[PDB]
């Protein structure tokens, strides 16, 4: 299938009460493997999947030294952006940063990502060609000109298409026994007595990995969009996922609907009735 | 592994 490595960084000003909170996490596909928290006592990058513990003490030293540099860089970013928008030293504010790479089935380079947000709105983002920027507003155009003059994108491109992909491959093969494993959803349907006349059919899918899934309802003929709802895929807490889909139906007509579950943990999809 | 170089906004 296809795979991604992504890092996420969040910096929050806590004005007067210390200097900003910094939180970093790394994911391979839908499995988190590292974290760094500037508030935690260890002051280290820490493992969060077991297969990353195959990495030696130099991995850890490096990652910790690099993530601390990230930490100060976005601390400085917070002071800078407060200028570019003329804000106040009481206001708490947020810088968000995300980057990483995607690879295809052949495990070769597909796509790369590098983008920022300020207070939850896009600031600047590297375009898919990995050569040009997308600045949301003029303030980011200021960053854009500086990043263009100092040729940020070209060095980014060497990491995203190269180093980033090299790590992902290594991670995928190191943690093969979990990361490359398929978990099929464990399906079951549920019936409720909503306004007497009416019944709710809830189709469940549980303990699957990855989180990607499709849950389609249907009648004797095709899909049933109206009167359906679809939950946000949620985490089980053990690295697997869950998601349900409901419909309201006329009493006595229940057993005529079929849920359809698509996932790569199953050869053929599964169908459910009540 | 994360980026080895950092750069300000």
């Amino acid at each position, epitope marked *: 299938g296809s795979h991604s490595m992504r890092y996420f960084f969040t910096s929050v000003s806590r004005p007067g009460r210390g200097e900003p909170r910094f939180i970093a996490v790394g994911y391979v596909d839908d499995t988190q493997f590292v974290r760094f928290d500037s508030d935690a006592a260890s002051q280290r990058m820490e493992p969060r999947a077991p297969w990353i513990e195959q990495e030696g003490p130099e991995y850890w030293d490096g990652e910790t*030294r690099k993530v*601390k*540099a990230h930490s*100060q*860089t976005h*601390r*400085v970013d917070l002071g800078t952006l407060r200028g570019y928008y003329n804000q106040s030293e009481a206001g708490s504010h947020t810088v968000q940063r995300m980057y990483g790479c995607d690879v295809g089935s052949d495990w070769r380079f597909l796509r790369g990502y590098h983008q920022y947000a300020y207070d939850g709105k896009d600031y600047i983002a590297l375009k898919e060609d990995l050569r040009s920027w997308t600045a949301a507003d003029m303030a980011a155009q200021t960053t854009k000109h*500086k990043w263009e*003059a*100092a*040729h*940020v994108a*070209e*060095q980014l*491109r*060497a*990491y995203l298409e*190269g*180093t980033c992909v090299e790590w992902l491959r290594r991670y995928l093969e190191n943690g093969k026994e979990t990361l490359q494993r398929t978990d099929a959803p464990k399906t079951h349907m549920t019936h409720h007595a909503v306004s007497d006349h009416e019944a709710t059919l809830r189709c469940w899918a549980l303990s699957f990995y990855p989180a990607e899934i499709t849950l389609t309802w249907q009648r004797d003929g095709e899909d049933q969009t109206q009167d359906t709802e679809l939950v946000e895929t949620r985490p089980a807490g053990d690295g697997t996922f869950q998601k349900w889909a409901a419909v309201v139906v006329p009493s006595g007509q229940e057993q005529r609907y079929t849920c359809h579950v698509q996932h790569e943990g199953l050869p053929k999809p599964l169908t459910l009735r009540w | *592994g994360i*980026l*080895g*170089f*950092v*750069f*300000t906004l």
Partner: T-cell receptor
Amino acid sequence: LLEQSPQFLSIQEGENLTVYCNSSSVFSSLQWYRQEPGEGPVLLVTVVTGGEVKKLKRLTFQFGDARKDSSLHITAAQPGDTGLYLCAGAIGPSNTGKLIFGKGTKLSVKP
Amino acid sequence: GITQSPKYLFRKEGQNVTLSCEQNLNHDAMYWYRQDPGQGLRLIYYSQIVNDFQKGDIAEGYSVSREKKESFPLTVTSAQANPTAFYLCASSIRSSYEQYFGPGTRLTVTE
């Protein structure tokens, strides 16, 4: 890795010379400097786009396609062009925040 | 520009000395090198961003700090075995891009 070539080059005026800078890796940017001993190196140019060509008076810098090499050309050499010429750069694949420096090509233009 | 004071520094062995390096180019990254006669630059320490720094290829005996964006002080302690050399500071707008050098400081140590 970063090697400069040749270590030394003697040229009587008016001739043209071309010194080189090469890497077993790939540069995300490459700098050329002049350095006088006992003073700080002086920045001539930065190149970034593979294949690109930049001119600075009599000097012409070129960047290889795969950004693995670079060259400095002096057309119509002068006795003021004498000195050590130093190549530096960022190694893309290295994922680091530092530049690498060469040992410098030393050029002597005879008056 | 980037300043280095003083241009000359003389000390007896054992005496810690701090070299200064200031810049108002609005650069985030700063770098220290030393150079022995007839040789090339050797990275001692560098800082990609205020409140961060990291060892170069020859950090033993040396110490730095980066409390302020503008300044990157270098201390040569009695742990460094061969401290006598030419010391060069450089800065770049972001780490791993074109560096601009300071004028350099000569340090001689005698027993």
